[PDB]
Amino acid sequence: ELDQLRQEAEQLKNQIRDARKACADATLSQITNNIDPVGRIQMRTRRTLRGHLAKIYAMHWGTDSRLLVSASQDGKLIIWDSYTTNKVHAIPLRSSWVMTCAYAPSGNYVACGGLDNICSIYNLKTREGNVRVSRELAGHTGYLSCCRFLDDNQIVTSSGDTTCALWDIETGQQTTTFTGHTGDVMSLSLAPDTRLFVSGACDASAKLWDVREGMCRQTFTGHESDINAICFFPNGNAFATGSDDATCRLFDLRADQELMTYSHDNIICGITSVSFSKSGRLLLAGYDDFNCNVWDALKADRAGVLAGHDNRVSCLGVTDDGMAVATGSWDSFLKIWN
Amino acid sequence: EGCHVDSRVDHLFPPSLYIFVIGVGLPTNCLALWAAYRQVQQRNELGVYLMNLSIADLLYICTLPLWVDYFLHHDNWIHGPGSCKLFGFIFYTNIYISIAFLCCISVDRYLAVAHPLRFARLRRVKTAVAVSSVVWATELGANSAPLFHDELFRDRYNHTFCFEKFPMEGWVAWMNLYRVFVGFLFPWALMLLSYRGILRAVRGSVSTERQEKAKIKRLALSLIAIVLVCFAPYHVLLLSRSAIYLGRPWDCGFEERVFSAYHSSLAFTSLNCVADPILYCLVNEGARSDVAKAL
Amino acid sequence: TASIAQARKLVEQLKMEANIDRIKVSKAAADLMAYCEAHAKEDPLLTPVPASENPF
Amino acid sequence: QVQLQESGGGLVQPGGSLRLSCAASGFTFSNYKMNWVRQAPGKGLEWVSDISQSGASISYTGSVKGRFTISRDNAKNTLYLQMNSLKPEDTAVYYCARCPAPFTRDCFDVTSTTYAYRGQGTQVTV
Amino acid sequence: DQRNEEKAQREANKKIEKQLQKDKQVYRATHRLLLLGKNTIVKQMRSGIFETKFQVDKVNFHMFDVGAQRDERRKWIQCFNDVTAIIFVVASSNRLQAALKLFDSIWNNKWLRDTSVILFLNKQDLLAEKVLAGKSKIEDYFPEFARYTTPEDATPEPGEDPRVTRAKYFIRDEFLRISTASGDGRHYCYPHFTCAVDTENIRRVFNDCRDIIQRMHLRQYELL
């Protein structure tokens, strides 16, 4: 019985592998023959935001491309006015271990998650004042690796218990639980249409989920180590994954296969955070060698090096308008690059 | 009138060795300043003290050359009376600022190593800046005695003394006693005590290898020894001369023979200005590493 | 237990991922290339923003 | 995907000998500290052996000390195990486990019940 | 005008800077510790994470117990890299080999190669009764224990036979073999034996943290 089911599973795996191989006419390298090179990018630190006492584990941008939420292990959620290097809000956190922070698309809310297994949403705009907890979303068995707002009264969370969840904030109860990963989910990137979200786990696999139906449509398996960061390509049905194998890869949601492998002989350090530019031409990846990296997505070749951090580059985000890169790192400093 | 104070080695040894010190200290003192500034930008309290010591040595180096000319021309000046009260004021008092700043470094090191979980407030950049400013002002004020009196002095042997009167004066004798006792020995005593406590603490450590304790012992011994080797000759001679002038102001022919020893000991006192940078930044692995990163 | 709850669940999910239609990688690269080319101008990271209209 | 397909085993009387190899088709096989872990009937996963990237660094536990050999043939992409002087101690599903991350010498988790790269063990009844 | 908004931003930033200065003092006052391997240590010290506070000699210590997570540790243990120490409790009675590899992984982890590990040997009386029994998990799963002699430097710890001592220090040197190899003053693995009847564990962690901070001072004060 069990052996028969395992044989059926092997047959199905071979079937999907054969289908993918048939659909594998070429790779993303097929366009790396005629596209003009992007040229050497040279972005300097346009500001260093020095308010954090510990490693900046995660950070996020607001839709205004001006405000900046940054999280660190001292127990702070600082909102930075990147234009004038001013700390608009300093939100103390109940639990100092925070691995993610999110900014609501319409402002007014900030969500932080970490080892506490809880996602807490803070009311930035307040009739009274004193930005405080609005809803303390609990229910995840393990820690929280990434929280992504989609609007008020809805949040999508990825946890280390191999499950992703969509929460209704006002009621405080889960709406849909996503299951199918066998490892700790690390990163979550919602689609621009905000109807799908991909997640990378510690089982060398990434899965596309439908936020409404609640099941996994496609499972992507191309890596040989834990996926540490994931990020949707702006739009075009693609996403990029950075792993601990010192390799970045680009997956297409429609072809259901990997397309590129951003790796080099020199690099042996994993990618902690991954992000994309507005055009999607540049893929920016933060490594463990205390140095961020710039990748031409269409032409796998490297085209930039954002050195300037003395420790692990933990988080890395690109503005919605595409005007800046705010790279947090364990050096307790956050730098904005043009 | 005065004593026939003349000598031969005051033509060669002090000037040449001052040339050596200014040649090989200014780059090293600048490197020490760079290392201290890099420590400060890393929120290291020792950076303030090291940078203050570096700038003190920098003023000493920059004011040495006129004194090179002074000793070179058989103890005769070429500039004016104001240049005396400025450059000689920086020529003196600057070694004493250096010793006070070395004592501050030693006390900070003792407060850190001996007491790693206490006195966190005094080990702050704000406190370091406050102490640096306080010591600068206090040393300058307490050494401000010469500017009140007259300095440029002409003897009966074609010698235009710029700061130091070899016929000697009462006030200069008393201030010499002060700068021997409160300006050199006492800060050096505190330096030795602080580094002895550091040695005791490193001996107490269980995560330190035997070789690490040996390196600590060698470094502390060098730091204590170089200061005395540079300073104690000159200060012993000053104590002797001041004691003589407190006893016998009339008899001053002994100044002619002790002239060589006195000025050569001043030349050797200048050695600490180059000893301090290479023995506080270059010798240490971390400071050398950050200097190389700067280079 | 472990047969229908785990292995048959895995084969059901595999059937789900197998029933969906796939496109060739040719379009899967052409769409990304076209999007990068179309939005190339509107990318300060890519094309240096003029200093006058540079908030940073 | 990362595949660790065990082989060999069957049945053997006490004092016998077997061998078992693990084909790898997902990772480099040269920069991972691969190792053997077993679950005896009635017990959890317990460590047996471990070989490093070069193959020079080699470790065992007490029960398998001297009676087990690890080969790590890079060309064949198969981690072997020469089982000698067998006792009823094994009677387990021997499966191979890979290091979580390459170019590291700290296999942090191998004994977890749901670790991603452990394979499907083959029973060795003795 | 915009000047009013600029003044408002300056005032807000001034308040935040004052608050962050106070928080800077607090953060540099408290020391963070990670406990790996037990609730008994938490009991004698006085939800995905358990935050517990204690003070000895007016120094602030924070210990963190990961007590509601999975068995996978390769990702959430990286967050505990700025901690002063990683307290490691072992049964020290194959539990022990699994403990040895967990310790080895922590020691050889890239991000834990600056963090010393206060090993504690959580239980010792079970080891005493195991070697009294003889056939338990002392000699069968570690043959070298029979072919090993008690080192001379080992304190007798009166009240036990030489067999208890040799087994105890055998597990201690089994844990110290990984510690000595590929390890220098960056992290030292202070080895200790745990007494559940006494509160010396807090004092010992205090002394170890004192030594750790003294080493970091020697390194940052360039005394090396």
Side-chain angles (χ1 to χ4, degrees), chain A residues 3 8-9 12-17 19-20 22-29 31-32 34-39 41 43-93 95-126 129 131-194 196-211 213-263 265-338, chain B residues 2-7 9-11 13-61 63-77 79-120 122-153 155 157-164 166-247 249 251-284 286-292 294, chain C residues 1-7 10-14 16-26 28-36 38-40 42-52 54-56, chain D residues 1-64 66-75 77-104 106-126, chain E residues 1-2 4-6 8-13 15-17 19-20 22-23 25-38 40-44 47-57 59-122 124-131 133-134 136-146 148-151 154-162 164-196 198-224:
Chain A
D3 59 299
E8 173 77 4
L12 256 298
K13 271 295 303 302
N14 295 130
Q15 203 287 300
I16 86 160
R17 175 177 305 291
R20 291 181 178 184
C23 301
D25 190 7
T27 55
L28 191 56
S29 60
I31 75 189
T32 312
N34 308 123
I35 302 174
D36 43 355
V38 80
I41 76 87
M43 301 145 37
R44 273 67 48 69
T45 298
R46 294 321 220 271
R47 263 161 280 271
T48 173
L49 313 174
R50 337 184 188 210
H52 279 313
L53 298 156
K55 54 191 152 303
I56 289 140
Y57 221 85
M59 61 95 57
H60 201 214
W61 279 95
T63 310
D64 40 349
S65 300
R66 199 220 157 121
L67 289 178
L68 200 85
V69 64
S70 147
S72 35
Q73 310 292 350
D74 39 331
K76 261 67 202 176
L77 217 44
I78 304 182
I79 278 75
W80 308 77
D81 203 299
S82 56
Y83 282 27
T84 75
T85 190
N86 280 176
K87 304 163 182 61
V88 195
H89 294 94
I91 323 172
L93 309 183
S95 185
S96 62
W97 311 102
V98 86
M99 281 155 218
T100 207
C101 73
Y103 223 67
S106 64
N108 318 312
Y109 297 104
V110 175
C112 67
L115 295 174
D116 203 18
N117 307 0
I118 308 181
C119 185
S120 52
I121 287 88
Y122 293 90
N123 204 357
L124 283 206
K125 62 104 186 178
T126 315
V131 176
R132 91 290 163 177
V133 281
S134 60
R135 182 49 50 67
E136 231 190 358
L137 292 173
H140 264 313
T141 306
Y143 73 80
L144 259 158
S145 57
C146 177
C147 297
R148 279 289 161 286
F149 255 102
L150 56 158
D151 62 3
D152 204 348
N153 207 3
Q154 279 241 299
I155 202 181
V156 177
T157 61
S158 65
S159 196
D161 59 357
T162 75
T163 66
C164 293
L166 167 57
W167 308 64
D168 172 295
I169 296 193
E170 176 186 359
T171 36
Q173 286 83 62
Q174 282 179 58
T175 294
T176 300
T177 325
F178 304 86
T179 282
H181 285 276
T182 36
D184 318 329
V185 191
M186 290 295 157
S187 182
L188 177 63
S189 95
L190 295 167
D193 50 62
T194 312
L196 301 159
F197 70 98
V198 316
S199 40
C202 292
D203 48 50
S205 81
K207 291 181 178 59
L208 176 74
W209 310 87
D210 195 301
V211 317
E213 267 75 3
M215 46 67 238
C216 163
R217 303 180 171 290
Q218 309 138 359
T219 292
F220 302 84
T221 58
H223 276 266
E224 50 173 62
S225 188
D226 310 359
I227 317 277
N228 282 237
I230 211 164
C231 165
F232 251 96
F233 184 86
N235 48 287
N237 306 119
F239 67 96
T241 65
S243 297
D244 269 357
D245 62 357
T247 316
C248 280
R249 298 193 188 192
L250 177 142
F251 299 87
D252 190 288
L253 281 304
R254 312 212 291 287
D256 307 1
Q257 300 144 52
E258 77 172 60
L259 260 70
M260 226 61 236
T261 39
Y262 310 100
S263 57
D265 307 59
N266 182 324
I267 294 169
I268 57 179
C269 49
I271 321 90
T272 311
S273 178
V274 78
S275 181
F276 257 104
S277 299
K278 179 173 175 303
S279 174
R281 154 42 70 91
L282 288 191
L283 182 171
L284 317 189
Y287 286 81
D288 300 0
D289 57 4
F290 322 150
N291 180 181
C292 154
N293 223 290
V294 172
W295 296 93
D296 184 352
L298 309 187
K299 312 176 62 67
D301 66 35
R302 204 203 322 318
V305 173
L306 293 184
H309 290 277
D310 193 60
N311 223 337
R312 177 202 189 64
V313 161
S314 38
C315 34
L316 192 143
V318 173
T319 54
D320 304 64
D321 63 359
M323 201 96 67
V325 182
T327 291
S329 168
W330 286 15
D331 55 0
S332 84
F333 303 122
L334 213 159
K335 302 191 157 187
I336 285 89
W337 317 75
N338 192 31
Chain B
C3 354
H4 182 62
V5 194
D6 200 1
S7 167
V9 315
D10 287 356
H11 204 328
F13 174 31
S16 179
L17 152 72
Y18 280 165
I19 291 174
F20 205 154
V21 170
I22 65 190
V24 175
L26 190 68
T28 58
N29 290 107
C30 178
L31 258 53
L33 194 151
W34 202 335
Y37 156 78
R38 292 199 56 172
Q39 294 287 354
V40 175
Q41 79 174 333
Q42 296 153 0
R43 302 278 69 117
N44 193 358
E45 320 88 2
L46 221 66
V48 193
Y49 293 140
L50 289 159
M51 192 174 37
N52 281 255
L53 171 86
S54 68
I55 64 183
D57 302 311
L58 283 179
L59 330 172
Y60 194 12
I61 294 164
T63 62
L64 269 191
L66 282 207
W67 279 103
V68 167
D69 316 338
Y70 162 86
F71 298 112
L72 181 49
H73 298 138
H74 308 91
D75 300 78
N76 278 249
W77 197 227
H79 285 37
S83 211
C84 302
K85 332 203 70 195
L86 174 62
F87 272 34
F89 187 46
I90 317 184
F91 171 79
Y92 293 73
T93 85
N94 232 359
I95 48 176
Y96 310 84
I97 295 178
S98 177
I99 316 167
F101 283 6
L102 292 186
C103 162
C104 293
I105 296 163
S106 74
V107 170
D108 194 4
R109 278 175 173 178
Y110 176 83
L111 291 185
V113 168
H115 307 317
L117 301 192
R118 200 177 59 179
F119 302 146
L122 309 174
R123 290 169 47 239
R124 217 176 275 181
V125 181
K126 179 260 175 181
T127 316
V129 166
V131 171
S132 295
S133 63
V134 152
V135 176
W136 266 106
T138 301
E139 279 272 357
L140 289 177
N143 293 302
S144 290
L147 312 110
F148 306 145
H149 303 57
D150 194 296
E151 293 188 4
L152 170 40
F153 214 141
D155 204 357
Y157 308 88
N158 188 58
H159 288 335
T160 60
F161 303 145
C162 187
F163 204 76
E164 36 199 0
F166 286 91
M168 214 52 115
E169 213 75 51
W171 74 269
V172 84
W174 290 102
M175 182 224 201
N176 274 358
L177 203 79
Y178 148 81
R179 50 208 336 171
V180 164
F181 263 51
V182 185
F184 142 78
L185 195 143
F186 166 87
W188 182 87
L190 300 181
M191 199 174 349
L192 173 140
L193 291 179
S194 304
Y195 277 123
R196 182 233 65 244
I198 287 160
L199 289 193
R200 201 199 69 173
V202 176
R203 170 159 58 71
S205 181
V206 307
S207 178
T208 49
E209 319 166 0
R210 194 195 319 323
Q211 280 75 8
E212 305 313 301
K213 302 176 187 59
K215 185 176 186 184
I216 307 285
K217 189 161 302 302
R218 298 179 205 118
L219 191 56
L221 288 188
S222 70
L223 298 169
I224 302 316
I226 204 55
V227 180
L228 216 60
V229 169
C230 296
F231 292 167
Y234 168 49
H235 294 87
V236 154
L237 294 180
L238 281 172
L239 181 58
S240 61
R241 263 142 44 71
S242 308
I244 279 298
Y245 176 77
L246 290 189
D251 195 298
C252 79
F254 145 81
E255 195 46 59
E256 170 191 296
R257 50 173 184 178
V258 86
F259 187 37
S260 295
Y262 180 55
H263 275 185
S264 63
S265 324
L266 259 168
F268 214 83
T269 301
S270 174
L271 263 305
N272 194 85
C273 163
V274 70
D276 284 353
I278 75 182
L279 203 72
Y280 274 83
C281 157
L282 286 211
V283 60
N284 319 306
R288 167 173 42 238
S289 76
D290 67 57
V291 161
Chain C
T1 62
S3 172
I4 63 184
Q6 187 259 359
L10 194 289
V11 311
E12 171 23 48
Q13 196 192 241
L14 272 196
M16 146 60 47
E17 293 126 15
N19 290 358
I20 85 159
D21 304 359
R22 324 261 200 181
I23 61 178
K24 295 175 179 181
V25 188
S26 174
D31 53 359
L32 266 68
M33 219 185 43
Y35 179 78
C36 294
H39 296 29
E42 323 165 30
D43 199 2
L45 294 193
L46 174 64
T47 304
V49 47
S52 302
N54 188 7
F56 297 89
Chain D
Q1 78 168 4
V2 179
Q3 283 268 60
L4 297 175
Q5 36 186 242
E6 323 302 294
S7 65
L11 189 146
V12 47
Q13 300 180 59
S17 59
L18 299 166
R19 253 203 184 292
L20 58 162
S21 61
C22 323
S25 324
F27 54 95
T28 310
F29 190 80
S30 316
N31 34 33
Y32 303 99
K33 196 159 66 62
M34 281 175 93
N35 37 298
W36 278 103
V37 69
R38 64 171 173 180
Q39 60 204 130
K43 273 79 59 184
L45 284 88
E46 50 188 1
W47 180 71
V48 171
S49 160
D50 158 88
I51 186 167
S52 287
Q53 301 87 3
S54 302
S57 211
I58 294 169
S59 325
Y60 303 74
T61 185
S63 177
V64 310
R67 30 178 284 129
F68 284 66
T69 88
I70 45 185
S71 88
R72 169 68 164 286
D73 306 300
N74 189 57
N77 293 300
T78 41
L79 169 63
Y80 285 66
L81 187 94
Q82 180 187 0
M83 275 173 25
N84 306 296
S85 295
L86 260 184
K87 301 155 60 186
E89 309 177 301
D90 281 4
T91 318
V93 285
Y94 268 84
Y95 35 63
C96 72
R98 196 203 65 185
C99 186
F103 321 106
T104 70
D106 45 296
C107 291
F108 223 122
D109 181 285
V110 161
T111 60
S112 174
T113 64
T114 60
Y115 174 102
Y117 331 104
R118 249 160 55 239
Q120 314 87 1
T122 51
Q123 267 266 320
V124 299
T125 166
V126 46
Chain E
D1 53 358
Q2 54 96 4
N4 264 27
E5 322 307 299
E6 173 263 359
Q9 275 206 0
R10 302 327 120 174
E11 180 186 60
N13 186 59
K15 302 179 183 306
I16 301 299
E17 282 303 15
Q19 184 51 59
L20 283 194
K22 304 144 50 182
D23 293 311
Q25 284 173 210
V26 152
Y27 187 81
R28 305 311 166 182
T30 89
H31 309 289
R32 286 148 288 105
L33 299 159
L34 172 63
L35 176 51
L36 261 156
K38 192 150 300 184
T40 66
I41 307 294
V42 193
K43 164 194 57 183
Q44 76 170 120
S47 171
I49 205 84
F50 295 86
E51 279 121 321
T52 167
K53 301 299 261 182
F54 78 97
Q55 283 184 2
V56 155
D57 300 3
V59 190
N60 264 4
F61 291 116
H62 208 152
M63 194 183 352
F64 301 104
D65 308 334
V66 162
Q69 293 264 20
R70 284 212 311 174
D71 307 59
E72 322 271 18
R73 325 179 200 242
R74 48 185 178 180
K75 316 301 294 185
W76 59 256
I77 212 177
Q78 307 183 3
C79 302
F80 296 88
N81 87 300
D82 231 355
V83 286
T84 303
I86 300 187
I87 305 178
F88 204 107
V89 280
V90 278
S92 167
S93 66
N94 204 354
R95 45 170 56 176
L96 208 42
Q97 251 289 354
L100 277 152
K101 303 273 192 73
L102 182 64
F103 188 98
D104 183 348
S105 69
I106 290 179
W107 204 256
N108 295 55
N109 197 2
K110 164 162 31 163
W111 312 108
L112 305 184
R113 277 195 143 289
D114 300 18
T115 326
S116 54
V117 175
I118 308 181
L119 189 66
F120 255 96
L121 310 198
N122 176 246
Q124 186 223 141
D125 44 358
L126 88 169
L127 170 131
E129 66 96 56
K130 275 204 170 184
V131 311
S136 193
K137 291 179 54 60
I138 295 291
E139 190 176 358
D140 41 2
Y141 291 89
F142 287 94
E144 305 174 0
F145 149 78
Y148 148 92
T149 62
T150 306
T155 176
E157 301 184 59
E160 71 199 9
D161 70 355
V164 162
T165 321
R166 66 190 297 241
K168 167 187 319 211
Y169 288 84
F170 172 76
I171 315 287
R172 201 229 67 239
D173 66 58
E174 279 275 340
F175 281 111
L176 277 205
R177 214 191 295 318
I178 311 109
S179 166
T180 50
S182 188
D184 66 77
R186 36 185 172 180
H187 52 123
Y188 170 74
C189 172
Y190 305 83
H192 302 296
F193 322 97
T194 294
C195 38
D198 210 303
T199 41
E200 293 314 300
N201 298 10
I202 281 302
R203 196 77 62 120
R204 294 211 301 231
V205 170
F206 172 43
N207 297 358
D208 304 355
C209 283
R210 199 166 116 61
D211 185 333
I212 298 153
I213 303 298
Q214 168 170 355
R215 281 220 60 101
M216 334 173 102
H217 291 345
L218 264 84
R219 292 183 144 120
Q220 71 171 3
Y221 278 72
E222 323 162 44
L223 260 160
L224 297 160

